[PDB]
A paper describes a structure:
The trimeric spike (S) protein is the major glycoprotein on the SARS-CoV-2 envelope and is responsible for engaging the ACE2 receptor for viral entry, and thus, it is a prime target for vaccine design and therapeutic antibody development. Receptor-binding domain (RBD) in the S protein plays an essential role in ACE2 receptor recognition, and mutations in the RBD affecting receptor binding and viral infection have been reported. To unravel the underlying molecular mechanism of the S proteins of Omicron BA.2, BA.2.12.1, BA.2.75, and BA.4/5 bound to hACE2, we determined their atomic structures of the S (BA.2, BA.2.12.1 or BA.4/5) or RBD (BA.2.75) in complex with hACE2 by cryo-EM or X-ray crystallography. According to our previous reports, the binding interface between RBD and ACE2 could be divided into two patches (patch 1 and patch 2).
As for BA.2.75, there are more distinct substitutions, including K147E, W152R, F157L, I210V, G257S, G339H, G446S, and N460K. Moreover, the residue 493 in the BA.4/5 and BA.2.75 S proteins was reversely mutated to Q from R. The crystal structure of BA.2.75 RBD in complex with hACE2 was determined at a resolution of 2.9 Å. The KD of BA.4/5 RBD binding to hACE2 was approximately 9.0 ± 1.7 nM, which is ~2.6- and ~1.6-fold higher than that of the PT (23.8 ± 2.6 nM) and BA.2 (14.6 ± 2.1 nM) RBDs, respectively, while BA.2.75 RBD (7.5 ± 0.2 nM) has a similar binding capacity for hACE2 to BA.4/5 (9.0 ± 1.7 nM). Residue N477 of BA.2, BA.2.75 and BA.4/5 RBD forms an H-bond with S19 of hACE2, while A475 engages S19 with an H-bond in the BA.2.12.1 RBD/hACE2 and BA.2.75/hACE2 complexes. N487 in the RBD of BA.2 and BA.4/5 interacts with both Q24 and Y83 of hACE2 through H-bonds, but it only forms an H-bond with Y83, and its interaction with Q24 was absent in complex structures of hACE2 and RBD of BA.2.12.1 and BA.2.75. While in BA.2.75 and BA.4/5 RBD, R493 is substituted by Q493, which is hydrogen-bonded with K31 in the BA.4/5 RBD/hACE2 complex. Although the H-bonds were absent between Q493 and K31 in the BA.2.75 RBD/hACE2 complex, there are more Van der Waals’ contacts between Q493 of BA.2.75 and K31 of hACE2 than that between R493 of BA.2 and K31 of hACE2. However, R493Q reverse mutation was observed in BA.2.75 and BA.4/5 sub-variants, which could weaken the positive charge on the binding interface and may affect the binding to some extent. It showed that these pseudoviruses could enter the Vero cells with different capabilities, among which the BA.2.75 pseudovirus has the highest infection efficiency, and BA.4/5 follows, whereas BA.3 pseudovirus has the lowest infection efficiency.
Author numbering:
A (entry chain A): 19 to 614
B (entry chain B): 333 to 527
């Protein structure tokens, strides 16, 4: 009886108990999120309690099997996931303190509110009040007030909590034999023991930085064009060579520039292709939308939805008294149960979201035959990248023509194609410097390269330098502006949004290559191409069972994340932006600020 | 004269757990195998060494009807020369199996919202089963090199596990009732026939 076969059998027991316990927790969560009551909350927490207690008990028992003694990589992967799910590494006192801090920062972010200077009785939360100002208001002062009030009132509360959060999370990471908590987070991309597919944690920093350099030309021209347009609308507020003020970017942080489209639209005379009207004309409902999405995946060779999908899913708002959490999510409860929760309205926005979420289900169904512990995307960016490329193909005018929502009358001129790519670039491209710069700051703080008395000093040096964005009001070290974003104060890694963005265009270029698409990559639809469906499926069925480098290769033929397909997607806009910025200053100066 | 009691086997209120499968000896009756064409799904109906079309053309010394419940993915294991948890540890057919295997979906009967833990199966055993062997022991399986003392602990597991059937499981995890008709051919009067 070797210590490998004892671990084979320990995983046997674990899987069978876990699928049963995870199912009860997943279904209790489903009943609350679809029928909000005081009772369903009780069951959701009770089942969640027994699932967490089962895992903590199994992490302790899994740590009794020395990982080094196992030749089998599949077994070693499964035990490793069970052992690193152990934060039974700090003392019970610090473990309790860290959770308390995590709950306090979460409560402040979700319940903190600011009140209007005129009327100390009209107050606003982040969602829905402050976000409404940041996405819709064109008034400089109203945007400035909401931006500063959130940071100076809620952010200052979070500053001492984050300082203790950094300390304890670092103690947790060091005792787990990582350099720091940032090193811990980078472990999601680590690969060991497989020659030619290994990947170190330090390598991720170098590959993020190497790929980001190739993004800078496209970003600097997008930044120049956006600044030039914004300067026309705000002549007294924006310098032609300075950074963009942080409160004029479309949301509370400038994570996305989507809401700048109205002021930056290249050719505002043309429409956006919106088939919402045609869908209502032909009397579509949510059933038709998901039937169409199911048809799309069948056309590439993927299986159709299970019978339980149509029975157990919630594809419309139940309305009336029964409330539900309407955030569109795809559920993989296990034991063959796959569901989509979505309060679908008959809109083009929700029609695309259906293809995105059903893409998640296809990934869930494809690796369903793997062991329970390997039923996930190859890394944190894979699952979201798969969902994004489905809405890419379903949105193209070719697909919209074939399914009868866009008549052959509509001719695609080169100007709607530039309007489309500009709108895409505002979301997809504008977030990349933001995402990179934020996670770089967090990585440096955990590594100890930024002392506490220079946190907000370095945060705004890096905002000006990397993102080309300047704070409208000076902030001392009583602020904590990163913590004013959900992912920072709610303890989530952020680099996943950078890597996923690069994966999705790597996937799409490969799938369009298999689909024999001729023309610009942004016009591609992989519908009716079973080679593309087969090429994607070979990665989907892997889950976590193989290194993400190898799973990436089974689609795109390369072992590492690459930025060239992203530039290929946006090349038509890039040539237009360079043309547009002919008589404009490209780049920015870090010393200009709107507060003189 | 008197019809074989196939209703008693197929229409039983509750089937046996596969680890403790049920055997009913059929003898001295007229066999209207035809009446089996009930439980319409008959998700599987596969015969071996014999063909279903006009099964009434035969005469055997004895018939054994084995009945149990498994889940959908494991129905394929009820076949000669198969492998897996069910075929290795619960119910093994011989290589030259002479008979039929009938299985149908009983999700309406054997599933509960709170989970039906009535039906169990054997998860660990020191060795494989011989054909038509049955192990009903509840002795703690020993995985380590240390003795278990009749109680489960580290490297010591209760050998029998539950399916926990719920009605919303996928088809693969839903419960299926299975009947295995074995046909015995010995040197004896062969007293099981019937037109
Ligand atoms: C330990 O794992 C839990 C649960 O992860 C589950 O088990 C995995 C093996 C895999 O099957 C996952 O898909 C499962 O969800 C982690 O808890 C989750 O935490 C995230 C955010 O931190 C939260 O959104 C989820 O709701 C949690 N899961 C559940 C079921 O509620 C937990 O973070 C892990 N702990 C450590 C220290 O890594
Ligand atoms: C690692 O172990 C797994 C089993 O956990 C091996 O995969 C199995 O290999 C056996 C061969 O004895 C087959 O019967 C199974 O069908 C395989 N799959 C599963 C899920 O068990 C795998 O080959 C082993 N790898 C190495 C390098 O030994
Ligand atoms: C929602 O839950 C309540 C009990 O809290 C129940 O009365 C109601 O029927 C449920 N509705 C649905 C659709 O399940
Ligand atoms: C779709 O689902 C049905 C369900 O009965 C199945 O039979 C069929 O093979 C699936 N695929 C297609 C292309 O219809
Ligand atoms: C579209 O094409 C015409 C010529 O066909 C050209 O003059 C025009 O500049 C093009 N538009 C863009 C945005 O390049
Ligand atoms: Zn998604």
């Amino acid at each position: 009886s070797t210590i490998e076969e004892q671990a084979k059998t320990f995983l046997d027991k674990f899987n069978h108990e876990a699928e049963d316990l995870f199912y009860q927790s997943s279904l209790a969560s489903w009943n609350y999120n679809t029928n909000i009551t005081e009772e369903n909350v009780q069951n959701m927490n009770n089942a969640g309690d027994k699932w967490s207690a089962f895992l903590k008990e199994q992490s302790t028992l899994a740590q009794m099997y020395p990982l080094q003694e196992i030749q089998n990589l599949t077994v070693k992967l499964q035990l490793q996931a069970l052992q690193q799910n152990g934060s039974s590494v700090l003392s019970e006192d610090k473990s309790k303190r860290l959770n308390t801090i995590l709950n306090t920062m979460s409560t402040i972010y979700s319940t903190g509110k600011v009140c209007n200077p005129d009327n100390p009785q009209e107050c606003l939360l982040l969602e829905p009040g402050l976000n409404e100002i940041m996405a819709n208001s064109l008034d400089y002062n109203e945007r400035l007030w909401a931006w500063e009030s959130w940071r100076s009132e809620v952010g200052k509360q979070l500053r001492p909590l984050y300082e203790e959060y950094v300390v304890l999370k670092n103690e947790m990471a060091r005792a787990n034999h990582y350099e720091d908590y940032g090193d811990y987070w980078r472990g999601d991309y680590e690969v060991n023991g497989v020659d030619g597919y290994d990947y170190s944690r330090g390598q991720l920093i170098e590959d993020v930085e190497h790929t980001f350099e190739e993004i800078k030309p496209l970003y600097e021209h997008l930044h120049a064009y956006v600044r030039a347009k914004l300067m026309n609308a705000y002549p007294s507020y924006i310098s032609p060579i300075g950074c963009l003020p942080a409160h004029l970017l479309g949301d509370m942080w400038g994570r996305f520039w989507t809401n700048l489209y109205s002021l930056t639209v290249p050719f505002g005379q043309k429409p956006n292709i919106d088939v919402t009207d045609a869908m209502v004309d032909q009397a579509w409902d949510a059933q038709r939308i998901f039937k169409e999405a199911e048809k799309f995946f069948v056309s590439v060779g993927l299986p159709n939805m299970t019978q339980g999908f149509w029975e157990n899913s919630m594809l419309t708002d139940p309305g009336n008294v029964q409330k539900a959490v309407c955030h569109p999510t795809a559920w993989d409860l296990g034991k063959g149960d796959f569901r989509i929760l979505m309060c679908t309205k008959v809109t083009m926005d929700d029609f695309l979201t259906a293809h995105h979420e059903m893409g998640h289900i296809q990934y869930d169904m494809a690796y369903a035959a793997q062991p329970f512990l390997l039923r996930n995307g190859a890394n944190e960016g894979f699952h979201e990248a798969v969902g994004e490329i489905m809405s890419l193909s379903a949105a193209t005018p070719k697909h919209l023509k074939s399914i009868g929502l866009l008549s052959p009358d509509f001719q695609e001129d080169n100007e709607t194609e530039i309007n489309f790519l500009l709108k895409q670039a505002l979301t997809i491209v504008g977030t990349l410097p933001f995402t990179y710069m934020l996670e770089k700051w967090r990585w440096m703080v955990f590594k100890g390269e930024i002392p506490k008395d220079q946190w907000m000093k370095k945060w705004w040096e890096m905002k000006r330098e990397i993102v080309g964005v300047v704070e409208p009001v000076p902030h001392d070290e009583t602020y904590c502006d990163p913590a004013s974003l959900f992912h920072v104060s709610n303890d989530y890694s952020f680099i996943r949004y950078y890597t996923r963005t690069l994966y999705q265009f790597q996937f799409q270029e490969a799938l369009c290559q298999a689909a024999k698409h001729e023309g610009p990559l942004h016009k591609c639809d992989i519908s009716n191409s079973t080679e593309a469906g087969q090429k994607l499926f070979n990665m989907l069925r892997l889950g976590k069972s193989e290194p993400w480098t190898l799973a990436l290769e089974n689609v795109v033929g390369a072992k590492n994340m690459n930025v060239r397909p992203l530039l290929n997607y946006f090349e038509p806009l890039f040539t237009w932006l360079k043309d547009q910025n002919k008589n404009s200053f490209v780049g920015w100066s870090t010393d200009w600020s709107p507060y003189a | 004269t008197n019809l074989c009691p196939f209703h008693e086997v197929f229409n039983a209120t509750r089937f046996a757990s596969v680890y403790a499968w049920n055997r009913k000896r059929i003898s001295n009756c007229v066999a209207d195998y035809s009446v089996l064409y009930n439980f319409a799904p008959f998700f599987a109906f596969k015969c071996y060494g014999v063909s279903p079309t006009k099964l009434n053309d035969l005469c055997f010394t004895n018939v054994y009807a084995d009945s149990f419940v498994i889940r959908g993915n494991e129905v394929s294991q009820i076949a000669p020369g198969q492998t897996g948890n069910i075929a290795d540890y619960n119910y093994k057919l011989p290589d030259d199996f002479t008979g039929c295997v009938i299985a149908w979906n009983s999700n309406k009967l054997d599933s509960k919202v709170s989970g039906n833990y009535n039906y169990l199966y054997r998860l660990f055993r020191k060795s494989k089963l011989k054909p038509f062997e049955r192990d009903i022991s509840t002795e703690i399986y020993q995985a380590g090199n240390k003795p278990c003392n009749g109680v489960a602990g580290f490297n010591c597991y209760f050998p029998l596990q539950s399916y926990g059937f719920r009605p919303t499981y996928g088809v693969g995890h839903q419960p299926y009732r299975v009947v295995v008709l074995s046909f015995e051919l010995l040197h004896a009067p062969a007293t099981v026939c019937g037109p």
